[PDB]
Amino acid sequence: HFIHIITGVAVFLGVSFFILSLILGYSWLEAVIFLIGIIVANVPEGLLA
Amino acid sequence: GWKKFLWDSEKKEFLGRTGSSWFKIFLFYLIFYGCLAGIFIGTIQVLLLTLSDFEPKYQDRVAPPGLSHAPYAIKTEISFSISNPKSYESFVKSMHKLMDLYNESSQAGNSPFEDCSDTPADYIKRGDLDDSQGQKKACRFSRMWLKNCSGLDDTTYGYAEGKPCVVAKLNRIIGFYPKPLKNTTDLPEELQANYNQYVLPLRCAAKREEDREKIGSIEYFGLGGYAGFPLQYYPYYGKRLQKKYLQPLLAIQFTNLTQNMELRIECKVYGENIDYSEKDRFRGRFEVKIEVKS
Amino acid sequence: GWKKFLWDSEKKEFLGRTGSSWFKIFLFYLIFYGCLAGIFIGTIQVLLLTLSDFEPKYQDRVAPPGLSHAPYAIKTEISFSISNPKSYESFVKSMHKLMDLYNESSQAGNSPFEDCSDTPADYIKRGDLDDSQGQKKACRFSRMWLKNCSGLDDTTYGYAEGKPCVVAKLNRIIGFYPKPLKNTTDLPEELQANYNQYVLPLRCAAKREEDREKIGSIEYFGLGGYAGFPLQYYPYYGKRLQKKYLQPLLAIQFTNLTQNMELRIECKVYGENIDYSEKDRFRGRFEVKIEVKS
Amino acid sequence: LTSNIPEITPFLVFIIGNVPLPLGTVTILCIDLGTDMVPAISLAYEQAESDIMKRQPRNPKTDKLVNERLISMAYGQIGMIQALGGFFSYFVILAENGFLPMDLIGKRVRWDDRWISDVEDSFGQQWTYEQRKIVEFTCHTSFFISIVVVQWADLIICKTRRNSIFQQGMKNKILIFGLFEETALAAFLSYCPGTDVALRMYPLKPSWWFCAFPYSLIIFLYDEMRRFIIRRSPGGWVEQETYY
Amino acid sequence: EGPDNDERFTYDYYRLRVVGLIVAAVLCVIGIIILLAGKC
Amino acid sequence: EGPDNDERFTYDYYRLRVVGLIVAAVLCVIGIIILLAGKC
Amino acid sequence: RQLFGGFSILLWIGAILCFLAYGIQAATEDEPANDNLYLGVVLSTVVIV
Ligand SMILES: C=C(/C=C\C[C@@H](O)[C@@H](O)[C@H](O)C/C=C/C=C\[C@@H](O)C[C@@H]1O[C@H](C[C@@H](O)[C@H](O)C[C@H]2O[C@H]([C@H](O)[C@H](O)CC[C@H](O)/C=C/[C@H](C)[C@@H](O)C[C@]3(O)O[C@H](C[C@@H](O)CCCCCCC[C@@]45C[C@@H](C)C[C@@](C)(O4)[C@@H](C[C@@H](C)CCCCC[C@@H](O)[C@H](O)[C@H](O)[C@@H](O)[C@H](O)[C@H]4O[C@H](C[C@H](O)[C@H](O)/C(C)=C/[C@H](O)C[C@@H](C)[C@H](O)C(=O)N/C=C/C(=O)NCCCO)[C@H](O)[C@@H](O)[C@@H]4O)O5)[C@H](O)[C@@H](O)[C@H]3O)C[C@@H](O)[C@@H]2O)[C@@H](O)[C@H](O)[C@H]1O)CC[C@H](O)[C@@H](O)[C@H](O)[C@H](C)C[C@H]1O[C@H](/C=C\[C@@H](O)[C@H](O)C[C@@H]2C[C@@H]3C[C@H](O2)[C@@H](CC[C@H]2O[C@H](CN)C[C@H]2O)O3)[C@@H](O)[C@H](O)[C@H]1O
Ligand SMILES: CCCCCCCC/C=C\CCCCCCCC(=O)OC[C@H](COP(=O)(O)OCC[N+](C)(C)C)OC(=O)CCCCCCC/C=C\CCCCCCCC
Ligand SMILES: CCCCCCCC/C=C\CCCCCCCC(=O)OC[C@H](COP(=O)(O)OCC[N+](C)(C)C)OC(=O)CCCCCCC/C=C\CCCCCCCC
Ligand SMILES: CCCCCCCC/C=C\CCCCCCCC(=O)OC[C@H](COP(=O)(O)OCC[N+](C)(C)C)OC(=O)CCCCCCC/C=C\CCCCCCCC
Ligand SMILES: CCCCCCCC/C=C\CCCCCCCC(=O)OC[C@H](COP(=O)(O)OCC[N+](C)(C)C)OC(=O)CCCCCCC/C=C\CCCCCCCC
Ligand SMILES: CCCCCCCC/C=C\CCCCCCCC(=O)OC[C@H](COP(=O)(O)OCC[N+](C)(C)C)OC(=O)CCCCCCC/C=C\CCCCCCCC
Ligand SMILES: CCCCCCCC/C=C\CCCCCCCC(=O)OC[C@H](COP(=O)(O)OCC[N+](C)(C)C)OC(=O)CCCCCCC/C=C\CCCCCCCC
Ligand SMILES: CC(C)CCC[C@@H](C)[C@H]1CC[C@H]2[C@@H]3CC=C4C[C@@H](O)CC[C@]4(C)[C@H]3CC[C@]12C
Ligand SMILES: CC(C)CCC[C@@H](C)[C@H]1CC[C@H]2[C@@H]3CC=C4C[C@@H](O)CC[C@]4(C)[C@H]3CC[C@]12C
Ligand SMILES: CC(C)CCC[C@@H](C)[C@H]1CC[C@H]2[C@@H]3CC=C4C[C@@H](O)CC[C@]4(C)[C@H]3CC[C@]12C
Ligand SMILES: CC(C)CCC[C@@H](C)[C@H]1CC[C@H]2[C@@H]3CC=C4C[C@@H](O)CC[C@]4(C)[C@H]3CC[C@]12C
Ligand code: NA
Ligand code: NA
Asked: Where are the transmembrane segments (chain D) (predicted)?
């Protein structure tokens, strides 16, 4: 359940960091690269094990 | 020199500098002493936190308990004339101050005083050292129990006709259980008779072998008529958990006292967790010098 | 759920609590992050104190010095067509940006520029690394010294007719004294002729043995006509102590360059405190790919 | 959950503030595998605090494992401190090598360009591409060590939640093993002759190891007091807010 | 401080690596000793 | 904590004095060693 | 399920990409660098462990 909530928070922030990047002038590709990296860095790993 | 060093009007200096300097030094010292005060207050607050409110962290210094007395005698001497009334006033004022706390009016109602056995009994445990069951309850101690030294009949308590009393008291200690000596073949001479296990015995005597004859009849008054302290008034739970608590008392009348002569009387309590000290003359025992000069 | 968790009107709660709680938590976090910020700022100020304003505490990473060049070529390749003018614009803009700092108008007056030997000379020490004798003085470097690559006659600098120039420059290092190789029997082939001790030699060649033939006449322009850097412009005292300081430059014209073919040219400086690195291709030497396709 | 903050803050300042990258890929992998595997396992083996049987049972409806308080202590309070601890070692390494803090805002665009061999520092020197990349990597290694140093404190404070460590004691052997082993991993990777070529870690000078020490002591002292207030005042503000 | 001020550009990384390795080995040994004391 | 709670009123001053003396002797020895190292 | 689950998959990609980065290098550029080869050799070892 927790993992689920965090995933929601992470996906949101990803789209947000995206708008901050394009309003600052990056490349359409750099924004998706950032979205992918941020969502991967916000979800915890190992809890169930 | 004299004037120039005090106040010159060209460089606008007082004691040696102008003004801006005085402002900077004063401001620095104010801020510095403020940081110092704040740090000291914080390090003292952490200490006020560490300790508990119902129990001193260390109880090795006040153990075993002492033995204090009223009246308040300076140098442990009670000297007074049977004729001049202004001779034993300082004593009666003290005796009265002590007995004034056992007035029945104070021990009124169900709370927080409860009735206890009129005869010596065993210990009573009112729980642990917590705040769970609120303020504990202490046993009542009536004034009248002391028969001829109560200030109710003869306010003076005896000093009026050459027969003084001495109200002995055991020092209050938190969680201290008094343990009297057992009936085994090894026991002092005096203690053999009236071996009420529930009573801590107190017995006075003469310091020197000669004074024995010059000392008369030591008449002890107490709970149940015994010369001791009833074990039911223990243990003591501390001020915070047992406000309005009364400790037992023992009256001692030194009847038939030789006139115009200094008598050294040593009183001593007996018990297992009771130990005397050659340095502290008030640990377990006490000394009194009486001289009823008339 | 949906509504009750967002806003209920009986307990007056938002997201789960009333208000006082939000005020206490917000106040705590504000004070906490304030203490954190203050401590970080203080620990960073002590660091800004520790260091000196005229000299980096560690000079082991920038040593020995590198060798940079203008123009600004990406991937170390200079490819341009002799017909299309919009092909070598990015190069000329850079070359011009570099040479635009040696304008005579900037080097005007007695201060802070002083005249130095028109022929290579030895070192010049303007004192220690202090603020005692104010801003030091640096030697002037005229544009005209570079003969055919100066942007004063042929603004393009050569790219217009298949004859490009390359202005090489030695990386500025504080207190670095260049030391050229001595006349002993051990010295490269090239360096033998014109052994002006006061000049640090720079010589370009071909990376591969084959390309040798395809490369024409390398014509070096510099101070005194030599292919090097005069030792008189050293050492460098740093920005703070020597603002308005100009470093020597060396022009290289690659005349007679084969058309429509990639040529790999490696330039290299020689000296005692000069060492190359197989990992850093800009330490002491540099590589350029030229292809004048027309 | 605490180490998440120091690994994400560098990628944030790097993109927003435009400064040189404080933490890389190899160093991050070193953090996850070093300070989060063995110390975490050691925690399982912990003993029971005296209090275990002197406390009321739990109501599953009202008390959960992951509630809004755990994220408050890990992310909010402890995390931000480990992040500041690593940022200090970074700023120190750069300032000493010639690059100061004021001049660092905006140098990224120019820093990450392999072609500008002329990069100029604060003291006016001119740096090539690998000469400046070496200092950046020395910052990655220092960040790593500052993380292990702050982890020391985080681990010590994790042993107990109501009692102090002076009360609980240091009788856990696996936890000690973890402290010594991690320190060894950092020293080994930073000083070994060849990690430069393969892993990209560079030797650390002695005055740098100590940059993270003040931030490591602050965490320990804070948790100790945080607990004293709990023991003395039940059902207070601290227990309502930070007791996880 | 004179032309021959080459020391200002040199660092003894060798000694540093030697000491760092000695320390690493010592700390690791201490760890093994504590982890295995008693064979359990 | 029961009638036989005599431990709450006892302190092992003997062990404390022994340790304090061992430490005092050690510190003093260290001092002499440092002060006289070399015979000057 | 262990070596090829859900979070390790991204690392498997990092390794792939880096190897391609070394191939285009050695095939094209004379005297290349090796940060990519060692990066792949390190990432693969992480997924395996
Ligand atoms: C593995 C991953 C994947 C990749 C990994 C990668 O890294 C590596 O593997 C590399 O790949 C290695 C692979 C190598 C492969 C091969 C190589 O080996 C071999 C060699 O490679 C070399 C290349 C290599 O050298 C390269 O350099 C590598 C790098 O690549 C990336 C580069 O940067 C970049 O790509 C360079 C490439 C090139 O530039 C590409 C350009 C674009 C493709 C394209 O534009 C070009 C071009 O146009 O494309 C055309 C094709 C078209 O069909 C495409 C269609 C376009 C669609 C347009 C729609 C756009 C869009 C989209 C909408 C959704 C939204 C929307 C808004 O925008 C909307 C709006 C519309 C309306 C826009 C319409 C625009 C129209 C545009 C189009 O029409 C076209 O452009 C057009 O058609 C064109 O043709 C035309 O020319 C147009 O030109 C112009 C267009 C403009 O340009 C353009 O539009 C622009 C500017 C838009 C701007 O945004 C506009 C703005 C200004 C803005 O509008 C603006 O004004 N704002 C103004 C604001 C303002 O005033 N404000 C004032 C304020 C007042 O108040 C013009 O304008 C137009 O008009 C015109 O039409 O629609 C076509 O082809 C051509 O045209 C082509 O030219 C970057 C990297 O990928 C890589 O490094 C080669 O050169 C070489 O030859 C080869 O041999 C995952 C990544 C990891 O997950 C992540 O970690 C990641 O690694 C990090 C993030 C990296 C970062 O950090 C690194 C350091 C460390 C990191 O690693 C750390 O790890 C970070 C981590 C991350 C996280 C967090 C934390 O930190 C850590 C924590 C983790 C911890 O926690 C864990 C717990 N779980 C545990 C622990 O792990 O993890 C750094 O090193 C990195 O650098 C850094 O990034
Ligand atoms: C090279 C690397 C070296 C690293 C050195 C790290 C040094 C440590 C850093 C800071 C230490 C100070 C932290 C003090 C925080 C308050 C702790 C506190 O309040 O604990 C309260 C406890 C009382 O618990 P209780 O009565 O409820 O237990 C009841 C047990 N039952 C239930 C069985 C009866 O007290 C106790 O345990 C008694 C424990 C007393 C410990 C005193 C330590 C302070 C002495 C010096 C501190 C340093 C000052 C500045 C140093 C700068 C150094 C350069
Ligand atoms: C320069 C300034 C730097 C400042 C940086 C701050 C760093 C972190 C700050 C503090 C962390 C260290 C604090 C150490 C705490 C020691 C506490 C202690 O001493 O509590 C005494 C205990 C209690 O005993 P008891 O019988 O009453 O317990 C009865 C237990 N009941 C009741 C369950 C039976 O005694 C025992 O635990 C038994 C004896 C255990 C002795 C442990 C010694 C090892 C301690 C740390 C190891 C070093 C790790 C670092 C590795 C890197 C090195 C290169
Ligand atoms: C617990 C997990 C947490 C951390 C896990 C990390 C996972 C990483 C896994 C593998 C990484 C492999 C790294 C390989 C080591 C280097 C190999 C290599 O590619 O080297 C290349 C270099 C050549 O460089 P160059 O010619 O360009 O230098 C020119 C120098 N100029 C020009 C200045 C003179 O070789 C040399 O320098 C020669 C030096 C050779 C170095 C020997 C060191 C041995 C390496 C590992 C053994 C240690 C295992 C630990 C055992 C513990 C027992 C208790
Ligand atoms: C490099 C530096 C290394 C060392 C840094 C040390 C930093 C740590 C220092 C302090 C830790 C801060 C902990 C923050 C917690 C404070 C929270 C607080 O405000 O909690 C107050 C509680 C009140 O609880 P309640 O139930 O009545 O609330 C009822 C509330 N209602 C009415 C709404 C229901 O407790 C009270 O008021 C009474 C208890 C007050 C406790 C004060 C403790 C001060 C201890 C140490 C600070 C001094 C350090 C000096 C060092 C100088 C350094 C230069
Ligand atoms: C269960 C526990 C058992 C523990 C038993 C331990 C027994 C003791 C064994 C070793 C103790 C320390 C040995 C000291 C020798 C280290 C070698 C060394 O000082 O090398 C330094 C030079 C590196 O060159 P440079 O600095 O001039 O480069 C230029 C530097 N720049 C680029 C910054 C300018 O080396 C070279 O050139 C040539 C390098 C040749 C290969 C050296 C091998 C080093 C790799 C591993 C050995 C250390 C194992 C430690 C085990 C710890 C357990 C975790
Ligand atoms: C150049 C440097 C050379 C250094 C070489 C040193 C060689 C080692 C020599 C001594 C090492 C330590 C010896 C340990 C024995 C100490 C004796 C001891 O632990 O005694 C304790 C008892 C005290 O009684 P209690 O605690 O029950 O009282 C009741 C306590 N209350 C009142 C609080 C309830 O002792 C008693 O009863 C009987 C006491 C009998 C006499 C003990 C003599 C102690 C005085 C001096 C000896 C220490 C010299 C240290 C030199 C340091 C150099 C500055
Ligand atoms: C210059 C700096 C380091 C000085 C910091 C001083 C700190 C430690 C001092 C300043 C004011 C102090 C507070 C003043 C008043 C109270 C109320 C009391 O009921 C509990 C302690 C408490 C909360 C004090 C704690 C310590 C305190 C916060
Ligand atoms: C909560 C406590 C411990 C935080 C204390 C923060 C202290 C260290 C901070 C607060 C404000 C800071 C000062 C703010 C401004 C300046 C001016 C600058 O030109 C020199 C540093 C100086 C003088 C700072 C020194 C550090 C300082 C005094
Ligand atoms: C936390 C407590 C109990 C122990 C703290 C240990 C600290 C002080 C130890 C752990 C590892 C140690 C470092 C290990 C290796 C080196 C390299 C050497 O060339 C200089 C000293 C230096 C940099 C050591 C300094 C001291 C050090 C940082
Ligand atoms: C200043 C630095 C370098 C060294 C500091 C040394 C301090 C920590 C040393 C000096 C003398 C030491 C004390 C000497 C004697 C005793 C008596 C013993 O029964 C308990 C420990 C105790 C109380 C020691 C504690 C540690 C102590 C206070
Ligand atoms: Na992880
Ligand atoms: Na983590």
From this structure: 70-93, 134-153, 174-191, 206-222
A41 touches chain D (CB under 8 A): yes
Measured distance CA(C181)–CA(B188) in Å, rounded: 111
Ligand 1 proximal residues by C-beta, below 6 Å: A 22-23, 25-30, 33-34, 36-37, 40-41, 43, 45; D 7-8, 11, 21, 24-25, 28, 32; G 13-14, 17, 20-21, 24
Q: Which residues pair with B220 in a beta bridge?
A: B252
Between CA A19 and CA A32 the distance in angstroms is 11
> What is the Cα–Cα distance from C217 to B228, expressed in whole angstroms?
126
Strands C113-114 and C138-139 turn out to be parallel
Long-range CB contact pairs, B83-92, < 8 A, 24+: B83/B294, B88/B156, B88/B159, B91/B159, B92/B155, B92/B156, B92/B157, B92/B159
This PDB structure is determined at a resolution in Å of 3.7
Alpha-carbon separation of residue D122 from B207, D64, D98, D104, D128 (angstroms)? 92, 53, 6, 9, 15
DSSP reduced 3-state for B285: strand
The technique is cryo-EM
B92's tokens: 């009666």
For residues B42 and B37, what is the distance between their CA atoms, to the nearest angstrom? 9
Residue of E nearest to D181 (CA): E28
Burial of C45 (0-12, 13-18, 19+ CB in 10 A): exposed
For B210, B217, B255, B257, B285, the CA distances from B213, given in Å and listed in that order, are: 7, 10, 13, 10, 21
Q: Which element (helix H / strand E) includes A23?
A: helix A2-23
Peptide bond into C64 cis (omega under 30): yes
Give the residue among C142, C129, C58 at the shortest CA–CA distance from C99. C142
Report the helix count and the strand count for chain D, using DSSP H and E: 12, 2
CB atoms within 10 A of CB G24: 11
Separation of alpha carbons B43 and B38, rounded Å: 9
Give DSSP secondary structure letters for D121-185.
-TTS-EE-HHHHHHHHHHHHHHHHHHHHHHHHHHHHHHS-SSS-HHHH-S--HHHHHHHHHHHHH
**Which of D41, D177, D195, D197, when mutated, tests ligand 4's pocket best, judged by the most ligand atoms within 8 Å of its CB?**
D197
Ligand 7 centroid vs F22 CA: distance in angstroms?
9
Which DSSP string corresponds to D181-214? HHHHHHHHHHHSTTHHHHT------TTTGGGGHH
Dist CA B87 CA B97 (whole Å) = 18
Who's near B210: CB < 8 A, 6+ residues apart?
Answer: none
D76: DSSP letter = I
Distance in angstroms (rounded) separating the CA atoms of residues D44 and D38: 10
Residue C38's contacts (CB-CB under 8 Å, 6 or more residues apart) are none
Residues 6+ apart with CB under 8 A from C288: C69, C73, C76, C77, C78, C166, C264, C265, C266, C267
Token reading at G45: 């070892």
Angle at D205 between CA D199 and CA D207, to 5 degrees: 140
